[PDB]
Subunit: 68 residues, 4 copies
């Protein structure tokens, strides 16, 4: 598994907490605490960090029409 915290930050600014939790499988309280900056990315498990990196990768690869 690979994790990239820059991808996780991109994710946290580019989708809603509901969509991140539903599309990544990560629990709603973890995603809300990340968005509120009540808990740090650095202290997540590698497993969580991988799920959020993968979702970020997939969403970034949506066609250019759905960007900007």
């Amino acid at each position: 598994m690979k994790v990239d915290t820059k991808q996780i930050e991109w994710l946290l600014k580019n989708a809603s907490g509901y969509q991140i939790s539903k599309m990544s499988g990560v629990a709603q309280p973890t995603i809300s605490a990340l968005i509120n900056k009540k808990r740090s990315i650095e202290n997540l498990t590698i497993e969580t960090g991988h799920k959020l990196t993968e979702l970020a990768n997939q969403m970034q690869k949506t066609p250019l029409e759905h960007h900007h």
Copy 2:
């Protein structure tokens, strides 16, 4: 410089030769040849492949609607 051919493929599938050339600086005949498969991605130089990889990364990281 880093190159990733998967990113170049994504680029060629998601943007026109005109837009790729205008945003990457690679001459449009090179891009047109890649899109029509008269030239292969694997035979590009590392320098060009890096330019196309950076453009793809940049487009992918543009904020979502």
Copy 3:
């Protein structure tokens, strides 16, 4: 930070808990737990995984 669990597995393969701990600052009991398969790599924090992914990168890039 970046993590690659493959790099971490290579490190646990190629260095002892004492040396990993001593060069990365990760607690030697955490490393031992990884080496006896009491804890998963996936359950380390991202920060710890980043430190171990780096140690592995550094050792791999030492000459020769």
Copy 4:
């Protein structure tokens, strides 16, 4: 295929041309031109760059004692 020019540079400092060439399939003249700067790494093909990046990864992953 992925290319990393630092991995290529590392390889050129850490192994001889004879068998960078011999393990990667790239012709020794290309490797010699790289070693003697005649030619830049950035002008290699992606295909060549991938073979050299791959070899560099493989050689770097050899155990501690061989470093």
